[PDB]
Amino acid sequence: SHKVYAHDYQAFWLWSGVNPQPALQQANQVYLHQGEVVIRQRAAWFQKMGLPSSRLTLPAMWVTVRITTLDVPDDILAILIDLPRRWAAAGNQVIGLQIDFDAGTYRLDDYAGFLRRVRTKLDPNFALGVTGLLDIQQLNALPIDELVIQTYQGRSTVNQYSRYLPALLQLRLPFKIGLVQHGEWDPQWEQYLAASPFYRGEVVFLLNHLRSE
Structure with a gap:
């Protein structure tokens, strides 16, 4: 029943507006x-944010884009799938594209269709990952290479996140748990x-530190 410290972990999200941290230099993966x-x-409108595509000293990386709507035309999907392309052209090891679903009430059919579309447009050397808030004979049907279950909102772990963890043993695809830095977390769940x-x-x-620190 302790708090999350970066020095105990090896994979990180670096979000728009967050400064790099020493923990990045011990990481095996980064989600940019x-x-x-x-x-x-x-x-729909794509807003490019965060670091410009460039050579940076990072481990193997994902490009992460948050999707707040699934009504997205082909031209924007084309921009999305060019992002890992650009990061790879700059000299970085790029694992693939991670979709961060933050869209609301959709049916899983529609998420599946959106991901099918992305994978059709994404270069086959790039993996396709999904992440989102916690929320299976059809869920394992997602056409995805990695799922990350987020346990936080903003700067805090969601209260009663643990309610969603016991059934993840039924997942049939590579999955991870997303934790916020310094949030509440019981590492027994890892075991x-x-x-x-x-x-x-x-x-x-x-x-980052809060301004009020």
Whole structure:
């Protein structure tokens, strides 16, 4: 029943607006936020954010994009799938594209269709990952290479996150747990989830200091 410290972990999200941290230099993977697809005037719009595509001293990396709507045209999906392409052209080891679903009430059919579309447009050397808030004979049907279950909102672990953990042993795809830096977390859960051959460990969302510090 302790708090999450980066020095105990090896995979991290670096979000827009978050500064790099020494823990990055011990990491095996980084999940680099690059922007969001949002509705502006009843139409989807990509907002590029975060670090510009460039050579940086990072471990193997994902490009992460948050999707707040699944009504997204092919031209924006084309921009999304070019992001890992650009990061790879800059000299980095790029694992693939991670979709961060933050869209609301959709049916799993629609998520599946959206991911099918992305994978069709994504270069086959790139993996396709999903992450989102906690929320199976059809869920393991997701056409994805990695799932990350987030346990936080903002700077805090969600209260009663543990309610969603026991059934993750039924997942049949590589999965991880997303924890916020300095949030509440019981690491006994790690041991529990280690029972599944599909468990791949944790990812820590790094945070800056609050202004009020």
